[PDB]
Predict the structure.
Amino acid sequence: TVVEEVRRFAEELAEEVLRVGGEAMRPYAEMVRHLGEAAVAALEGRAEEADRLVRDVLEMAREVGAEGLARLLERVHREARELLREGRREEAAALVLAAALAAGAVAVAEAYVRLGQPIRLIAEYVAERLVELAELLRRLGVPLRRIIRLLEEVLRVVAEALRRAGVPEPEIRKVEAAAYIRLAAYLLRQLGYEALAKRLLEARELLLEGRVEEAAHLLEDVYALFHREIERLGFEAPEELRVADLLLARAIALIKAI
Amino acid sequence: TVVEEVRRFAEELAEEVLRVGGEAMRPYAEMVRHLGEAAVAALEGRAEEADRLVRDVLEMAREVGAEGLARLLERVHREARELLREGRREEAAALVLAAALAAGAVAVAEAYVRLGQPIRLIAEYVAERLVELAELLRRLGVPLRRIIRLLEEVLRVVAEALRRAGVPEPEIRKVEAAAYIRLAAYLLRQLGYEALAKRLLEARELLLEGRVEEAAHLLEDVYALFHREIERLGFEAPEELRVADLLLARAIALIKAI
Amino acid sequence: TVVEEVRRFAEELAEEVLRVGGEAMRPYAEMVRHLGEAAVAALEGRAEEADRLVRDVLEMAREVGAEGLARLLERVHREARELLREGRREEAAALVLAAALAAGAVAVAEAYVRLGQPIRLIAEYVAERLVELAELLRRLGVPLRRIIRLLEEVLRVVAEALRRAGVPEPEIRKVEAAAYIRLAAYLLRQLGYEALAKRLLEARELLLEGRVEEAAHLLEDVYALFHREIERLGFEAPEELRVADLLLARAIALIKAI
Amino acid sequence: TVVEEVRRFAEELAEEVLRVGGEAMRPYAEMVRHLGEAAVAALEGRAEEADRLVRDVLEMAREVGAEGLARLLERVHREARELLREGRREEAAALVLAAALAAGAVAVAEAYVRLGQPIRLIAEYVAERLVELAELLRRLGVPLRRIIRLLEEVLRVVAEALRRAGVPEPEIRKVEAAAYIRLAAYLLRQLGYEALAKRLLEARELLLEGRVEEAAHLLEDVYALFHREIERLGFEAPEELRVADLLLARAIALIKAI
Ligand SMILES: [Zn+2]
Ligand SMILES: [Zn+2]
Ligand SMILES: [Zn+2]
Ligand SMILES: [Zn+2]
Ligand SMILES: [Zn+2]
Ligand SMILES: [Zn+2]
Ligand SMILES: [Zn+2]
Ligand SMILES: [Zn+2]
Ligand SMILES: [Zn+2]
């Protein structure tokens, strides 16, 4: 069912891209669909069809004008080759799926920016998509640290896209910080820290409304309590606590830099 | 059920405006909803609430920047006063409904132009909306020549909106000519001229694809056959033939002027 | 009795405006009285009379020269429409009552500034008015965080009015900081923290006398004790504690920025 | 046998390209052969091999310098993807075969222009190849209107190629007009109008000999008789008559514009 899940994910993202953007950007739907096909090819054997499809999507990125997507696609090409030589298949499909998500998200984000919708919608959209992708990659079997690295790459591509569309920098920082707080809350919820997740999401809501100062104050309070809890456990803690610590630190840094 | 139909029409148009344009254009949803309210007030008694709502909608049109919509709103204000004094209610609500449709169609057309969708979509959207409004006005009881006059006013407002959005003039002419051919086919279908309607719609299809020359040739052939049929009946013909003749003449003139 | 309370509140504020400013500012008494009428109309059914009265009051604000009041009145217009469509009535009247209080307080504050009364009087007047309005909104049923948001909107309008009257910026900051300390003390008193409220009011008294440094020292001491008490309860606390924490943080920031 | 027919068509066109042009134009023989393989791949399953081969041929067109062929190959690529996703196979191979014929005919026409052969040979060659392709596409199952659209695309590419080779514009118009009259005669012959086709081909013979005026006069006479026959049938006529009408109109327009 895994390859069916990858196909469904790619097709749903392409349909949403077409619905939001119409026929103005049909290329992005083709990129999403071919990257879904390359991913399922990698999951079902093969190593050369994946290379060819990734090169095709790289050519489309070259002609359309997507720069960050093109760079990410070259990186997917080289890595996917290396890990397919090494015999590991899940991680190559993981890189391809992250590439497809980057393409869909850049399409939808540029659509939202062109027709002037508020930044809350872009931020919530990207955060929810990242959480869904993280759930999928957890289902496949990729290790968590690689998951977070892929998600940060996707966020970087989306931020570059929003920069090219003229969105002011503080709004881009708000988008990224919202994504980081959502990811941190998602990680914290699995281990059974519900109150922590609610406080983090309250801080996120105060951030998306433009109340930066109350967001920073509530974020620093919840981070202080969390960090005391971390130092309680000494030289032992589940890895998701360790990753959430860095996610929360980066979120705080971004909010302070707004 | 008539007032319920007017309410449903206004709310559906407002919901579509919001879906296509999002939160970027909330004012237009309010204008559509208040114009629907003024129309249903006029249909259910009253003469002062309609005045107040139309004045409020005129104020919104003034602040947003809609020029043609504001002019049409002043015009419906004055006329609605006159006919409400004369005791005729259906035609005042007809003017108000035409105003609401003009506002909604202007919003959706500006949304389509902002995100760069093809002109076939705008043309087909506007033409189908005009046909639906014509069916509604036929249900209420307005005489047909007033129906066509209101529909042409709506088309004029939409063309002005598309002009302000930078759409090139030939595309505006294509939009209007497609609207006229659709209206003419709709009128011809009721009296039982199916083949004529199919040929008119074939010519319209060739027009929307950019094949102007084949569209003009096929339009002139079908017009010649139709006009011979009209001259067959001498000094007698159902009134819809007489209206469709002028619709077809204007459609041909617009196509030639592209 | 609720609509009677709203009527009494509006008439009392209008009478006080007339007593303080005389016949110099008659428009503001009319704005207060019509905003009270729109609020009681909203509380007693209706959705169009409220629209008309708010539009009339906006016209008065436009002609008189009130800028911040006009902006807030447009915002009241749009929101009142939205929530009246959604069927919620208390919050629309809450926005209208906040607008009436902003108009009355702007009038009285400009009167006080014109005849050169000390800033302690403006600060104490505004703070007590905000406390009375908060009690009223608690009686109606508005949730507390909406209460605080409306009160901050009122404070923003009052600060803009005082800025247009030439009052120096540090006095405006003193007014706002006194208002926040009064609101925080009011919130803390309900939950049974008397000593905290007395110390906050002592710090406020030292602030209004011009002793900024002793006010900041005593405020930081009481804030440190309060915040230790907050962190004692971990991930649980009555919601008014959470709101008072942000109120105190903003009050301290404003005092430091004087 | 259909895939064998496509292979035979492609190889025969490639051999003719090589015989006419020698080793000077070897790239075009390879492009024709690869488009033959891509078409037969599409007819025998597959969707990714067709993608790859069309991209390879696009690269060849990029390096050689064929511009219009490159544009048509990009269009072929995008459409072939869409219709292969929709599951329709005959039309994608039809687009590929049209592309191969455009490439081969471009090569042969440039060869004829380089060694200075008269324009009658180019016109007759192109017209006969178009008739053969239309016969093949009729054998496959493509609808006739798509057949005519593909044939016009082939003619447009050929005209662009001849323009790039410095052939004067009136000779290009002669080529296209001869092609349209040949196509109209071919369509008319199936319905069983032998006299009409004979007179059209007499007009074509007079046109290719440089006698433009007698060509236009005889063409207008046969067109007048044909159009009277069309108007005889009213609102009913086989589709081939309708297509021939537009073909004849375009031929007359081109001859008049010489
Ligand atoms: Zn490679
Ligand atoms: Zn740490
Ligand atoms: Zn009036
Ligand atoms: Zn006529
Ligand atoms: Zn209003
Ligand atoms: Zn101390
Ligand atoms: Zn705190
Ligand atoms: Zn491709
Ligand atoms: Zn004709």
